[PDB]
A paper describes a structure:
In mammals, fatty acid synthase (FASN) contains multiple enzymatic domains to catalyse all chemical reactions needed for de novo fatty acid synthesis. An ACP carries substrates from one enzyme to another, sequentially following the chemical reactions. In metazoans, all essential enzymes are included in a single polypeptide chain and are arranged into two main functional domains, each carrying out a key chemical process and named correspondingly the condensing and modifying domains. The entire cycle of fatty acid synthesis requires that ACP carries the substrate from one enzyme to another repeatedly. Here, using a strategy of tagging and purifying endogenous FASN in HEK293T cells for single-particle cryo-electron microscopy studies, we characterized the structural dynamics of endogenous human FASN.
For each dataset, three-dimensional (3D) classifications isolate a subset, from which 3D reconstruction shows a fuzzy density associated with the KS domain. Focusing on these subsets, we refined the condensing and modifying wings separately to high resolutions with the best to 2.5 Å and 2.7 Å, respectively, from the 1,3-DBP sample. From these two separate reconstructions, we generated a composite map of human FASN incubated with 1,3-DBP, in which an ACP is seen bound to the KS domain. This composite map is of sufficient quality for accurate modelling of most of the modifying and condensing wings. In all of these groups, the catalytic cavities of KS and MAT are well resolved. Notably, we observed that small molecules, orlistat or 1,3-DBP, do not alter the overall shapes of the conformational landscapes but generate a few hotspots within the central region.
Residue numbers in the entry:
A (entry chain B), B (entry chain A): 1 to 854
Write the structure that this text describes.
Amino acid sequence: MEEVVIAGMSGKLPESENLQEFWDNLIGGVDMVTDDDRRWKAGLYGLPRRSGKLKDLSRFDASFFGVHPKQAHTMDPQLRLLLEVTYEAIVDGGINPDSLRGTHTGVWVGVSGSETSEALSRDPETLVGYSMVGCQRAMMANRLSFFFDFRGPSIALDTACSSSLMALQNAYQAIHSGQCPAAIVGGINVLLKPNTSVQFLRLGMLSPEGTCKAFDTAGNGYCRSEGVVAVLLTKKSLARRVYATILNAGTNTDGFKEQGVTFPSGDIQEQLIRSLYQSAGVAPESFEYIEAHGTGTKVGDPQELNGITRALCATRQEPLLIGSTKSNMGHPEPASGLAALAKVLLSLEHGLWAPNLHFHSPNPEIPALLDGRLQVVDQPLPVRGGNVGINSFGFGGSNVHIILRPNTQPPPAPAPHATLPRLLRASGRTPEAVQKLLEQGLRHSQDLAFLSMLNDIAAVPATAMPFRGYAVLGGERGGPEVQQVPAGERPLWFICSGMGTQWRGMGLSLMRLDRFRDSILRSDEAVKPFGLKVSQLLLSTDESTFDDIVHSFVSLTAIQIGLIDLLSCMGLRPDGIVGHSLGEVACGYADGCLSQEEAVLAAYWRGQCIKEAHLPPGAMAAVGLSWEECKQRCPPGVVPACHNSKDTVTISGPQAPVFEFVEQLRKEGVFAKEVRTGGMAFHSYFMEAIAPPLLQELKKVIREPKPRSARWLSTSIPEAQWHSSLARTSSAEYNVNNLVSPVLFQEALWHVPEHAVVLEIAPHALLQAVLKRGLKPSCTIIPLMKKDHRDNLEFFLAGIGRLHLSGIDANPNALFPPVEFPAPRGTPLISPLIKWDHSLAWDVPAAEDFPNGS
Amino acid sequence: MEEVVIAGMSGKLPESENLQEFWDNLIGGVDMVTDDDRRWKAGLYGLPRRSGKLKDLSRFDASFFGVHPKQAHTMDPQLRLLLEVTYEAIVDGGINPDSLRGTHTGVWVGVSGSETSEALSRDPETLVGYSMVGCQRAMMANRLSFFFDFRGPSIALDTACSSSLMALQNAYQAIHSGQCPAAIVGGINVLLKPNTSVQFLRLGMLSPEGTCKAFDTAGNGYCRSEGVVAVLLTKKSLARRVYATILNAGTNTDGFKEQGVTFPSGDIQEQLIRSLYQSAGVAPESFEYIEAHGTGTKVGDPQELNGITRALCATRQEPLLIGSTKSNMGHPEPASGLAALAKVLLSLEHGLWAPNLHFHSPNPEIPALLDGRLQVVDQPLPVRGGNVGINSFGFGGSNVHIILRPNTQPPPAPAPHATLPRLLRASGRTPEAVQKLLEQGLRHSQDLAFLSMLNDIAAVPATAMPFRGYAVLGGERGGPEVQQVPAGERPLWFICSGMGTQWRGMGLSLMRLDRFRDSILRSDEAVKPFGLKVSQLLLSTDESTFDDIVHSFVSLTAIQIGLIDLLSCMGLRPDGIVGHSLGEVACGYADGCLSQEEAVLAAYWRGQCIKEAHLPPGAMAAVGLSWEECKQRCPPGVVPACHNSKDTVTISGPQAPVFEFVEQLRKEGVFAKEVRTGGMAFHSYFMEAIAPPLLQELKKVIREPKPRSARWLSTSIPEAQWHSSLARTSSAEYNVNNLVSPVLFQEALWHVPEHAVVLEIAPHALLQAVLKRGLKPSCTIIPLMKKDHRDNLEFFLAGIGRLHLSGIDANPNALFPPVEFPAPRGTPLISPLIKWDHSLAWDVPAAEDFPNGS
């Protein structure tokens, strides 16, 4: 009752390390079968010289899959290759494999031989026990279920040549019945000992020329080949990527035949095909292509093709295209179904049917090839539309047939959010893997679904993949950044600065993000009744607006609240919060003890009470003196205000004490930074009378307060008063004490741990130099906005990107509108982009480890 | 949506050639594991000396399964044994295998090793191609599907130790979904090369003592064993025999474990058990026995038993019985599930739980064994009632569990038809097989369901099983009769005699049969209005009744019609019909051109017209003269009447011509048999006037006649008049010509073919001596009734029995009321009663055909 789709694909086929190399060789018309001594001699025992073999067989990333190096040498090579391509298939689906770690997904593998098992057990005096664990035929599925933590059925089955498609049929029935949510289908074949080829030669099944002349007059046998293929099957609701939908799948057996056990029977195959499409409810006119078994034998090809033309070409009125990938590749026996399925799905993805090789004249015993009812694809011709049938028949008599419907999702309509720059994060075992992923993301910068699945597969722990990277796409600067991430957990800390950081155009560039704009409009409707709206303070800003201190207060708190909201939808939960005056006001929303409206009205009421009453113009000169030397060198009535660092302390007072330290700024090395904000002496004794009018207004907004958390480190309260009744809750008296007390921004900074990642929440990171000398040198400081930046959205996205390079997982897909659930076809492949650590070589059995009759 | 039942069982286990030998060894407490050099040496390579092995491995009936003797030598022995036990399982179900020849039944076999394949391919210069066909792992299922002509899925699967029960689980899902009507589940394991045992020894899994000390403190490993088991699964409506009903079946996998791939996890097993019974809807209180995996390892037994006591023994209030057949037998790896299932089903059939061996003290790490919540069966204790759970866990991590409910059908209530004698037919390859079946049927003569399934499995062609036999059970004579049947088809011919064969008590003994009594009452209601009823002519017969000729006529035709009805429900369709006067009247009902009422009224009207008019008393003297000499030696007005043979001709005439040939009977060798029937000259010139009154009455009964068939050979019409208008239909003029013409019973007999089987339909076979000298000597004449026989039902059943020995298939189950569809439990097993032609020895690989490190 559930729809079953094909979600992922990966493979290793002759002269085809990756699935793309496979496709290229297939459409290139290259003879992937070769005459090389890569496994045994050229023509020993009278064997054919030509065979299809894999490029390499001794490469395995043993540390990733957690196998001991002594156990990896005594493993079946086909199991090592199956582990790697099984990871690559899940990643090709767009699914992180960690989301299937407890589920009931099953594994079905089609194998037919275990030659490594009998090569590794020839000497009973030097045996090891690990050869049983790494080479037994059930372990080809059980090791996959063990590593990927799969709780479903784990079966290895052998059904001769139809073994791989039979596994697909059983996995189909498991998903269809609701037993399993997902499944993995595999198929493996490796040619190691020549005695099996001598057996097939004496049976009469091997061509002397080593060629599958499919549907040809000169066909006299097949050519043996290798291959390791895996696909990922899932229900429709879990699929990020869809290649095709399996309409139906079934099987039968020939039964008794007078001719023999080996001989094919086309009547039972015709019955299987007709019963399948009937039960599926599809008309035979709707087909356009059928991938035949097509092994090239003398008696098998007319039986199969006459069965096809009886079941399908009765009342059709159109030619039916037919092909066979064994003419391009050779015939891997238990892995022939998934290799043909890979060719079909690659042909559907690229829009062109891959041609057949070695087809010159039709077989005269097949009359449908002579009048045009069946047409062999011998040239590349485009895909028009309809269903594709795939059948594979074993020589024992097992018949399997699949009907699948390709997906035809068009590329989406253009949208105004598609012009915004995006983030792309990557991970890998080596720097080259991260470079490959980032450069392929740069090549396809306008493909939104491709970037979404690439961002989805990047959340791997640093112990598994120790190299991470990022690149900002769609911007003007660009540039991949790759570095090695240290292992372990690093705490994330939030620091939000105070006043003096406003400018012309605060956060406009990232007003294009929807969630930031929603937060800004929420703060707008909150201050709307109070004769104010921060939207004109954002868009219609000139120099007559931010010299006011009320507008500066609300335009600081709203921007910090919007940044915290963006970080909260990002998935990030802070471990420690420490602010600075109005930053400490926004720390209430950062901690959750405040909400939007109370924070914005508290900031506006602070500004309103300050602008209501009037006190002598104040100063904020900054001097190059410590905290203790400033108390003894100020005149009476002049108080130190800000304890930023051990060398930077801000003084507060009137103009004549400000003019007093102009002369002492000439003396020695003393800073003469006299930056003021409206000429008002915040954090001073001049506002001891400001609090009682202000406190009255506040009690009407932050009534029934909530207690502060242990993560919030207070900066207006000294350390010995942290347990008092005033500093447990974020009440109205807590906020008015912030204005009348000096900010202690040094003793809060020494409680930050050793390897913390510090995020600065400010419209301009002017506290970055203070935090560098004020914190431990094993900390990372990341700014989020920069004053007078042309595209501040690119600056924000680079901060999120280097947050990925520190070790904190943060998915930038949540910032943008989500992509529709089926990806459109023609989306680029992901499984060729995965690279492993292949610096080591492992043991492979040779031809001398098998009995030669000596 | 369909109920799945276990219908058949067969097996070959250590020291257990048949399933009964297995049961005996199991309850006998015999250690089926031995220390003999039956496969390799005693303790070479440091291997344990003890192992469980089959009794013989080189026996195969190659001609029955149609394999060439050169192909049989290069076959896997385990496939040969699987073919034989697969036939035995179907026969044990009570089902003829020919009724599944076109159906969609599937085959699932659990294998794990193919050592014969690598022993037969060691020399690439002397290879043969047949070793691929007979030893490839897919062929273990494909050869079964090929021989038995099965169209369903044919899969060989390997899932380590749980491989046999996994096949049962998949076959369960196929029947449950409605995909398959029936299925065959197999499991095979054979120990041939010692290198695999050395691998298991180095892994640490083998006990040094070669003992499975299940649930014991001293358990340190398992003992390797052999075994070939097959069961037959079917839907409920097809089952003649039910062992149990599968309530539920399922599987899962352990997934990732910190301890390793090999280590068992009881938590996932507990989850599987709890999910199964929940989905099945059965309470955990309803269980009474669970067959554990019970391999005897140090860390596996506490994990499995603690998982069982968490899933099952939470709120139970009763002890739960637990056992393990591996303590009796050893551990066959991929065939452990079906062997345990065989032990459980044998224990349910015999009413006693088979005890465990080698259990002395409980494992201290299992606290449920120390307080009584789990109880080990170490003594034979009776079966009380409830469900039985069977689980088998592979060492790769595959977990499978079965819930099955035993059938508790009581033996039926006694009935009056159970005292009647029955027929039992048998077939076999040898005379000893037929003798075994007949003597086991004699031992259980009162078991009706057992005899019904034995009669059902006996319909095999003579080319397959050339020895047939029969025995009449419940009679007083008895005696098995065994002979060799000649091959080919033999035509069946019906001959029904005329008058002069009546006696006192015609057919009474077989009035107890229901269909004969129904035919008699149908003829009774037909003649009821005509002031007659043949029931008092049957029961209330004395010597004042059958001296009348009307009663003799109806009591001949009714008995012959009832015999023909019994033969028609028997399944038999005649090839040639030839009668004799009133026999030729009953030939109309034999041919189908007449019905019951027309035949009975025609016979009664012949008698009524004969008894109406009166003619001079006639004679039927019989003389020892030929047909031509009788015409020249009779006086004028005296006509020869019956041409029985070349030496026997009946004369017809008055008393004074009858007295004339008394004197000539003294002369030479002339018979003086003057037997008359009422003193009336039938087949003579004295009844030329009898026909016109008779014809008038007949036109009112056999109005609108039907044409005679080519099988009916006329005896009142000469050969040259066979195409005339009088002899094409069985009209009223056809019957009145029978009375006025001589019967030509010789020229009809020369048209009978060479090897015909002749059946005599008469209440007393007085024509048996005539047919012996009148027919060819290659014909068999079978009488059906004998005059003055004490039990004529035993005489009829012996005729049907020797009809089976001729070659004609005839099932005597149709004569009696049918047996209810589920057979009651305790019905004797059938699969130990099948014997083969095992006079030849085939090749088995030795230990020297494997690499020893030389």
